[PDB]
Design a protein around this ligand. Structure first.
Ligand code: NI
Ligand code: NI
Ligand code: NI
Length: 124
């Protein structure tokens, strides 16, 4: 019919930074924006590409906040538009951490993802 063989993924980076200076947490989090974009481009999107129906993700954006907390909670999100439903949420989450089922040391503990739309057209 009009079937949805794909779902939409939102990947997130979550980092806590020291803020003993008691500065604006948007400026503290800003310090690793470039680092997060480079991570997304050179590791995260490459890891997940083999699961995409038609390649494409949004620009990484930081969640804005209003606090100068002693520890700054920082969050970035990017959307991957079209991933085959063949690949479940856990399977995709795992792919962030390990690139072999017999890998001893996980990577990217600061990265997680969700299905942000459970029904999208694969376009393929
Ligand atoms: Ni159809
Ligand atoms: Ni539809
Ligand atoms: Ni100061």
């Amino acid at each position: 019919g009009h079937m949805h063989d794909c779902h939409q993924v939102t990947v997130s980076r979550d980092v806590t930074l020291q803020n003993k200076e008691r500065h604006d947490c948007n400026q503290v989090c800003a310090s690793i924006d470039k680092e997060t974009e480079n991570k997304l481009n050179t590791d995260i999107i490459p890891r997940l590409t083999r699961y995409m129906s038609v390649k494409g993700n949004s620009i990484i954006a930081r969640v804005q906040q209003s606090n100068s907390d002693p520890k700054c909670s920082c969050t970035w999100r990017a959307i991957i538009w079209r991933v085959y439903k063949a690949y479940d949420e856990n399977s995709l989450n795992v792919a962030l951490h390990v690139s072999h089922p017999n890998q001893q040391i996980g990577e990217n503990p600061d990265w997680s993802l969700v299905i942000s739309n459970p029904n999208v057209h694969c376009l393929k």
